[PDB]
Amino acid sequence: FACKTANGTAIPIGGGSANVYVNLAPVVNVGQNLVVDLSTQIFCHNDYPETITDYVTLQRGSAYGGVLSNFSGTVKYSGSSYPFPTTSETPRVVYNSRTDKPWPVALYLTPVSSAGGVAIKAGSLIAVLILRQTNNYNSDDFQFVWNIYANNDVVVPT
Numbered sequence: 001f002a003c004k005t006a007n008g009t010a011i012p013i014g015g016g017s018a019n020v021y022v023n024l025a026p027v028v029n030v031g032q033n034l035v036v037d038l039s040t041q042i043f044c045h046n047d048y049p050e051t052i053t054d055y056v057t058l059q060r061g062s063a064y065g066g067v068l069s070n071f072s073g074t075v076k077y078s079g080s081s082y083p084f085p086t087t088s089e090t091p092r093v094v095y096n097s098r099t100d101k102p103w104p105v106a107l108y109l110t111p112v113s114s115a116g117g118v119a120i121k122a123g124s125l126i127a128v129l130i131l132r133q134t135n136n137y138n139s140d141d142f143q144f145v146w147n148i149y150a151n152n153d154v155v156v157p158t
C-alpha cells in the first residue's frame with residue numbers, strides 16, 4: 001500500500017509524510033463553503049490485492065493558520081461528514097485494487113462572521129491530514145501524513 005499526489009509527491013510502503021499544494025477559490029463570502037477536495041490530489045493503491053485487503057481511515061485532521069482562525073469546518077470522508085478539526089477516527093475505506101484510487105477526503109470551510117480580509121495566505125499551511133492504513137494480513141498500522149498548503153490567497157469580502 002502506497003500513495004501519490006498530483007504535485008508529484010509520494011509516500012511509500014510503511015508510511016511517511018508528504019506535502020500537497022492546492023489551488024483555492026480566491027474569493028469566498030461569509031456563509032459559503034470553500035471546498036478543498038483532496039480526492040483530486042491524493043491517490044492510493046493496494047500492492048497485493050490478490051491476497052490482501054487494505055483498510056484506510058482519516059485518523060485525524062487538524063487545521064492551521066488562517067483556516068483554524070477564520071473558518072468553521074467540516075470534513076467529508078467517503079460519504080460522511082464530521083467536524084473539522086476532527087474529534088474521532090473515521091470508518092475504514094476498503095482498498096482492494098492496485099489501480100490508483102482517490103483518497104475520498106474533502107474539506108468544507110465556511111468563513112466565520114468576522115473573517116473578512118485575507119483569510120488564508122498564499123503558501124501557508126492550512127491542514128494536516130493523517131491517513132491510517134491497516135490490512136487483513138498482518139499487524140501493519142501505518143500513518144501517511146499529508147501537509148496541505150495553499151497556493152494562493154483567499155479573500156473574504158466585507
Ligand SMILES: OCC#Cc1ccc(O[C@H]2O[C@H](CO)[C@@H](O)[C@H](O)[C@@H]2O)cc1
Binds near residue numbers: 046
Ligand atoms: O509473496 C508475494 C508478496 C507480497 C507482499 C506482502 C506484503 C506487502 O505489504 C505491503 O502491501 C500490502 C498491500 O497493499 C499492505 O497491506 C502492507 O501494509 C504493505 O504496504 C506487499 C507485498
